[PDB]
């Protein structure tokens, strides 16, 4: 019956759970204990981007590491300029509620999500000097949480119906639907080679999908509460998850198990966005206790806290070549740390 | 000022862009945003049709109705097939929360289970929002709709079927008064937020007048904290 069939699935979890224990010969602390500590890392707010008048919900650096897109709830999506504070574009959105944004690797498009589960894709470098929607990608059933571009003709979208889809831009239909989740997806990240991507759902599970066939490869269950942020290692060989339990748990993809957890007694407040720095050593995490701590990726020790925001810290981002770390708080100011 | 011709002209574009945000930020402050709660058939479609001047938006349906030189907003959250707490942070800062309770649900049993009556289902729904950590300053403009059916149904169906401890008669003057007594006492804060109850009719046009008389109170209270008086 169902119970007998479910029992086979129940016992199927045992060997993989046992295989992880059999492969845990040495932990990260006792193999990297003989390492030089990174020390205190103090960072100062180099710029403050004070154009918005509402809560900053997302941001995304460009590939050129200078242009910067950021979307707030006041129905505006302003394309900043990190070096000299200028609003290159001010894109008026069709809906006031937006929960994500993205910037194309080439720089021609910006994609904004929303609570009306339509991924509207904008066009910047066009004739007539306007910024008009190139396409609206409807087809989801819940809400849209985070969307990234593979290239100018592909986009991967998270959703609230526990499904990640892969669209095409010339047409309007989907290509593959990454199903298999129980809780809905809140954030994802594409690998540097843009062939695999992991999504942090709301059931303490992160899955490693592939964009070719369209089904999960590895699932990780180490967290207790919902995973609220996620990001790949700069080498595409590991990924870290920040959850509501204030623990930044770093996984890997070749051993398929949890490497380490970064939790402190003083912090109880949740996590809003986790983004690795360049070289995979500074695991910057944005907590919702108004602070933004800086964890070492190999040692549990802390570093300089990037505090200074008057509200939650909604999203982070580390530039591709790694000078600046822009954080967008729910007060209307972005702060491009360095 | 060690700036090139294009760089200087680029800054002229920045502030011209900036001025259009400021000239539109004054229009957003005057705007009033109002979340709506309640079940799908508990009067959700009743009060929204009283005054509305304005299908791809299956997520959130919006109504841009206005009254007496004030543009109201109406985000009926019914299409979110997920946990309320997930996106409830996205609605922080909303001016008010219109909440509807169907008065004729005392004798109506839940569809999926033969228990947990609609008012009792809304009993925990009210607590999850009125006592929510984020929703502490957003006053709940609570309405008593479907009042044209409650008075003629309690003649043969006593209200004691819903509440095990009723201790009262079946007079609409006191039955309606008794019910709202618990609702106004469900808040953990008796001063930070207030509930503007109103026993609306099926055809009365004073509903929009009432929500106007309660939103203006929020704006006054919101401005009093800023000015420092309160």
């Amino acid at each position, epitope marked *: 019956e169902l119970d007998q069939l479910r029992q086979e699935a129940e016992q199927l979890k045992n060997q993989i759970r046992d295989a992880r224990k059999a492969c845990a010969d040495a932990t990260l602390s006792q193999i990297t204990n003989n390492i030089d500590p990174v020390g205190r890392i103090q960072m100062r707010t180099r710029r403050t981007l004070r154009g918005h008048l509402a809560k900053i919900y997302a941001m995304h650096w460009g590939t050129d590491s200078r*242009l910067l897109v950021s979307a707030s709830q006041d129905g505006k999506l302003i394309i900043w*300029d990190s070096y000299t504070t200028n609003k*290159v*574009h001010a894109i008026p959105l069709r809906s006031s509620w937006v929960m994500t944004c993205a910037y194309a690797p080439s720089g021609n498009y910006v994609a904004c999500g929303g609570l009306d589960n339509i991924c509207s894709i904008y066009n910047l470098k066009t004739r007539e000097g306007n910024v008009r929607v190139s396409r609206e990608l409807a087809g989801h059933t819940g809400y849209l949480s985070c969307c990234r571009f593979l290239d100018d003709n592909q986009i991967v979208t998270s959703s609230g119906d526990t499904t990640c889809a892969l669209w095409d831009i010339e047409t309007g239909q989907q290509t593959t639907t990454f199903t298999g989740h129980t809780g809905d997806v809140m954030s994802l990240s594409l690998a540097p080679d843009t062939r695999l991507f992991v999504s942090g759902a709301c059931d303490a599970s992160a899955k490693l999908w592939d964009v070719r066939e369209g089904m999960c490869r590895q699932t990780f269950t180490g967290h207790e509460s919902d995973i609220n942020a996620i990001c790949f290692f700069p080498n595409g060989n590991a990924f870290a998850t920040g959850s509501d339990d204030a623990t930044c748990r770093l996984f890997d993809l070749r051993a398929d198990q949890e490497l380490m957890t970064y939790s402190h007694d003083n912090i109880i407040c949740g996590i809003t966005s986790v983004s690795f720095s360049k070289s995979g050593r500074l695991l910057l995490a944005g907590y919702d206790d108004f602070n933004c701590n800086v964890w070492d990726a190999l040692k549990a020790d802390r570093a300089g806290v990037l505090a200074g925001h008057d509200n939650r810290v909604s999203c982070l981002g580390v530039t591709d070549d790694g000078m600046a770390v822009a954080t967008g708080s729910w007060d209307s100011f972005l702060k491009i740390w360095n | 000022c060690t700036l*090139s*011709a*294009e*760089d200087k002209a680029a800054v*002229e574009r920045s502030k011209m862009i900036d001025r259009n945000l400021r000239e539109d930020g004054e229009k957003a402050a005057r705007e009033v945003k109002l979340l709506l709660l309640g079940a799908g058939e508990s009067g959700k479609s009743t009060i929204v049709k009283q005054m509305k001047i304005i299908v791809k938006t299956t997520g959130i349906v919006e109504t841009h109705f206005t009254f007496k030189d004030l543009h109201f907003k109406m985000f009926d959250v019914g299409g979110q097939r997920s946990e309320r707490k997930k996106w409830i942070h996205c609605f922080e800062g909303v001016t008010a929360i219109i909440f509807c309770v169907a008065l004729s649900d005392y004798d109506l049993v839940l569809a999926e289970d033969e228990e947990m009556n609609r008012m009792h289902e809304s009993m925990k729904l009210f607590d999850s929002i009125c006592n929510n950590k984020w929703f502490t300053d957003t006053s709940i403009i609570l309405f008593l709709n479907k009042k044209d059916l409650f008075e003629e149904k309690i003649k043969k169906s006593p209200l004691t079927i819903c509440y095990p401890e009723y201790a009262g008669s079946n007079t609409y003057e006191e039955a309606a008064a008794y019910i709202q007594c618990q609702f106004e006492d469900l808040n953990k804060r008796k001063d930070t937020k207030e509930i503007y109850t109103h026993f609306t009719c099926a055809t009365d046009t004073k509903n929009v007048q009432f929500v106007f008389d309660a939103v203006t109170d929020v704006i006054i209270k919101n401005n009093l904290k800023d000015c420092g008086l309160f």
Partner: single-chain antibody
């Protein structure tokens, strides 16, 4: 998208007329428009500049005071008023648009031109080559030396190359440098050094014959260069 303008005629010296530029196909409010003339036997000369919203306005030395420029955003037109004009202005005028932000391409599209006939400290840029012969299949190199260091302190160096095919209006080829315009093949390739600059064409066809003008944009007034024609 097009920039069509009307006006011109036979003018007695000392008169006063109006030149109207009607724009259709883009967002005129966001574009800082220019005015460029061309004598019947000379190169190009800058006339006036108006920014978006008529914020800042610049004028050439030879038309300062007696020329007035204005834009009509609701009417979507660009206006030039010339008063006390002399016989040295027997030239036809272009209507040139330009948008200024990060990564933009100024002087993208040029108008057609209205012929006006009259009956009787800045950067100096010169091109030594003039009417150089060329054959289809052989690479050609054009050098346009400047007089001031065009490399700004922010890493951006400004030099625009324009191609004027016989008959019609010039079109943009290479903005600041090493950047191709929007709608031009990859054959063109420009390089610079700060004071001496070079434009190299790998392969050329019958439609590539014309006159090449090099323009800087470091500081107003912005000066063109003497034409360098191509000979078969």
């Amino acid at each position: 998208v097009q920039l069509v303008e009307s006006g011109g005629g036979l003018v007695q010296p000392g008169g006063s007329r109006k030149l109207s530029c009607s724009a259709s196909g883009f967002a005129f409010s966001s574009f800082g428009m220019h005015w460029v003339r061309q004598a019947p036997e000379k190169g190009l000369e800058w006339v006036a500049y108006i920014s978006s919203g008529s914020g800042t306005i610049y004028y050439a030395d030879t038309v300062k005071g007696r020329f007035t420029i204005s834009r009509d955003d609701p009417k979507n037109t660009l206006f030039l008023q010339m008063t006390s004009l002399r016989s040295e202005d027997t030239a036809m005028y272009y209507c040139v648009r330009s948008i200024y932000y990060y990564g933009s391409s100024p002087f993208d599209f040029w108008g057609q031109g209205t012929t006006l006939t009259v009956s009787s400290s800045d950067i100096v840029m010169t091109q030594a080559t003039s009417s150089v012969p060329v054959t289809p299949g052989e690479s050609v190199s054009i050098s346009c030396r400047s007089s001031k260091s065009l490399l700004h302190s922010n890493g951006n160096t400004y030099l625009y190359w324009f191609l004027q095919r016989p008959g019609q209006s010039p079109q943009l080829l290479i903005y600041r440098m090493s950047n191709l315009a929007s709608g031009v093949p990859d054959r063109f390739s420009g390089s610079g050094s700060g004071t001496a600059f070079t434009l190299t064409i790998s392969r050329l066809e019958a439609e590539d014959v014309g006159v090449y003008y090099c323009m800087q944009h470091l500081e107003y007034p912005l000066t063109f260069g003497a034409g360098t024609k191509l000979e078969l």
